[PDB]
Write a structure and sequence with these properties.
Layout (H helix, E strand, L loop, with lengths): L8 E9 L2 E7 L2 E6 L5 H16 L10 E3 L10 E6 L3 E2 H7 L4 H20 L2 E2 L8 E3 L5 E3 L6 E2 L22 H5 L7 H16 L9 H12 L4 H5 L4 H9 L8 H4 L5 H10 L10 H5 L23 H12 L5
This protein binds the ligand CS[C@@]1(C(=O)Nc2ccc3[nH]nc(-c4ccc(OC(C)C)nc4)c3c2)CCN(CC(=O)N2CC=C(c3ccc(-c4ncn(C)n4)cc3)CC2)C1.
GO biological process, one term: response to estradiol
GO cellular component, one term: dendrite cytoplasm
Organism: Rattus norvegicus
Length: about 325
């Protein structure tokens, strides 16, 4: 059932996921059907997607063009979110094409330009990965899926060793497994570093097969953390775990990526820094020599200002979508 008229017609299936289903429709646009009201978690992800995307306006962030839902809270069971139609995503593109360096450079620039705007609003995306980067034939790139987004909260980032996490395994920073809830901007930079590595070789750089295996993959390439980085680890159990490991040397980036541009690998190194406090921030990344041909702070805008039971969340979703009613 895809009930979006009178405005949208001639539907065609694009894809499907845990969120629901997305189609293309003539206003052509993309339309996704969300049916989240039976569970608090799904309502939280829906309200985050909507509240954040309605408050953002940026060329490298997917917008929300329209939202269709019933005229009353009682009748509202589904929500249809209308967005600009794109042609593919970076996950699909990487299955069929090896990207030239100059495409990687331009795509990375756009990811970081959009991320600058997100981080300037004090928001964290928290699930950056190739499938959340939409592309078209003109090589425009848009960041999508803010369902796991949060307002940054560095003062409350601390958690225990081996604390469960929801965002996509392969793109998780090492500190998620050691001491962090993913409430600081550095979590997104790590994910971008993973995406860069993936564009350079068409394979995920750290394909952990399960939770702790993800840290095995990271330490297998970065090598053992330094004493100073262990001094920043916070948790007794994380310190003891890292101290218990045999010494592992760093695998050189030029051995993993022998055909990559040296400036791309220097930036990769800085995004894939073990210690989040030493990891490059988005504005620094934009200013890195690899991206020098595109860097222009005057054309990298920032946000105008920074940023419960399932029944209360439904009321909030109802209120947040009210502006699209005739
Ligand atoms: C990246 S997928 C996404 C999206 O925005 N996709 C999108 C948006 C605009 C688009 N324009 N164009 C495309 C497109 C076009 C062609 C194409 O490829 C062709 C080759 C077919 N790929 C993409 C496109 C695709 C669809 C969903 N979006 C998030 C989104 O809508 N959110 C709201 C609700 C969320 C959610 C998550 C999970 C659950 C749930 N329920 C049960 N379970 C177990 N889990 C419930 C609710 C999460 C946040 C993200």
């Amino acid at each position: 059932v895809f009930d979006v008229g009178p405005r949208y017609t001639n539907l065609s299936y694009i894809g499907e996921g845990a969120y629901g289903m997305v189609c293309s429709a003539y206003d052509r646009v993309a339309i996704k059907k969300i049916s989240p009201f039976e569970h608090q978690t799904y309502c939280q992800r829906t309200l985050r997607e909507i509240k954040i995307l309605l408050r953002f306006r940026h060329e490298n962030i997917i917008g929300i063009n329209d939202i269709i839902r019933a005229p009353t809270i009682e009748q509202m069971k589904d929500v249809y979110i209308v967005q600009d139609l794109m042609e593919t995503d970076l996950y699909k593109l990487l299955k069929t094409q090896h990207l030239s360096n100059d495409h990687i450079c331009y795509f990375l620039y756009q990811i970081l330009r959009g991320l600058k705007y997100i981080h300037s609003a004090n928001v964290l995306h928290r699930d950056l990965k190739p499938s959340n980067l939409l592309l078209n034939t003109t090589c425009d790139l848009k960041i999508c899926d803010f369902g796991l987004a949060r307002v940054a909260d560095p003062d409350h980032d601390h958690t225990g060793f081996l604390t469960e996490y929801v965002a996509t395994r392969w793109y998780r920073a090492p500190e998620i497994m050691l001491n962090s809830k993913g409430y600081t901007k550095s979590i997104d930079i790590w994910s971008v570093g993973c995406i860069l590595a993936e564009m350079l070789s068409n394979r995920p750089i750290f394909p952990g097969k399960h939770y702790l295996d993800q840290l095995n993959h990271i330490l297998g390439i970065l090598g053992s953390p330094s004493q100073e980085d262990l001094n920043c680890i916070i948790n007794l159990k994380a310190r003891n775990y890292l101290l218990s490991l045999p010494h592992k040397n760093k695998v050189p980036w030029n051995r993993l990526f022998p055909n990559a541009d040296s400036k791309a690998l220097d930036l990769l190194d800085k995004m894939l820094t073990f210690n989040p406090h030493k990891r490059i921030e988005v504005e620094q990344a934009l200013a890195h020599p690899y991206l020098e041909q595109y860097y222009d702070p005057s054309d990298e805008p920032i946000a105008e200002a920074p940023f419960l039971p399932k029944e209360k969340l439904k009321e909030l979703i109802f209120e947040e979508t009210a502006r699209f009613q005739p």
